[PDB]
Amino acid sequence: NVYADSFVIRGDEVRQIAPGQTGKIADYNYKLPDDFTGCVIAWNSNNLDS
């Protein structure tokens, strides 16, 4: 089975959403494991979200 998590984040912070990264969002909001973590998919939804 597979789980999918979803959130909206800023471009510079997308870089933080990776295994082994650190930063305000990776540390406080959503700590990705320091292990396997599957694919991270991101697209620029500025039209809808902004």
Sites for other proteins among residues 8-37 (CB under 8 A): 19-20, 22, 34
Rounding to the nearest 10 degrees, give the CA dihedral for residues 18, 41, 25, 1: -80
In whole angstroms, the minimum distance from the beta carbon of 19 to other proteins comes to 8
Q: How many residues bind other proteins (CB under 8 A)?
A: 4
Q: Are 19 and 33 in contact (CB under 8 A)?
A: yes
Residue 34 or 49 having the CB closest to other proteins: 34
Q: Are 40 and 48 in contact (CB under 8 A)?
A: no
- Interface ranges with other proteins (CB under 8 A): 19-20, 22, 34
